[PDB]
Amino acid sequence: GHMQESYSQYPVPDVSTYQYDETSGYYYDPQTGLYYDPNSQYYYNAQSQQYLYWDGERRTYVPALEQSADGHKETGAPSKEGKEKKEKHKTK
16 A cells, blocks of 8 residues: 555553642643543543543544443443343343
């Protein structure tokens, strides 16, 4: 291949370069302006109040608003846990 050079992306960060803000429990990500959470890899774009994620396959930020369409009934999609929509279906 010799076409589609594929441009317009982000750097390759490391959370080991972020700043922990113990006043609230987040990391702050000066390379972006985002906040990262250590337990929740969904970044917080404070600017617009968007929740994002780093997708290193696409080397860009994407929104993390909902996934795996079995909920779409909150911010997130809790419906993978196995209780999800309850037993439904009779008991047999």
